């Protein structure tokens with residue numbers, strides 16, 4: 001997939017990653033465990049919702 | 050819901066989020082007076098739903 | 099001046115944030131008071 005000079009994108013899964021020379025790791029994330037009838041409020045800062 | 054509570058019921062003494070619909074009673078202390086001017090104090094209870 | 103409502107927004111060129119004043123005591127009603135239905139004391 002092609003990216004542009006300011007993009008962000010999340011990489012997930014069971015895998016092994018080495019950073020490219022033109023890619024920056026900015027953060028590590030964990031899936032948040034949720035039982036049925038339990039949740040969290042998320043904001044999409046791109047669209048505001 | 051801000052509700053009345055107390056022996057001689059006062060407004061704004063209880064607060065709730067659910068309305069208890071179901072059959073209960075509440076109890077009040079009244080002061081009445083007779084055609085003879087005998088001042089009486091009553092203990093009453095009201096079965097409601 | 100206009101109100102812009104609803105989505106994430108970047109002020110374009112030659113646009114600035116505008117402060118909206120409220121008449122004396124209006125602010126308390128809006129926040130300190132808020133709902134009159136929930137409590138009346």
Ligand SMILES: Nc1ncnc2c1ncn2[C@@H]1O[C@H](COP(=O)(O)OP(=O)(O)O)[C@@H](O)[C@H]1O
Nearest residue numbers: 052053054055065066067068069073074075076
């Ligand atoms: N969350 C609620 N929703 C609806 N009614 C309620 C709630 N909590 C209490 N009540 C009713 O409000 C009344 C408050 O009076 P209370 O002081 O409890 O009377 P008593 O002196 O008989 O205990 C009670 O009868 C109770 O049934």
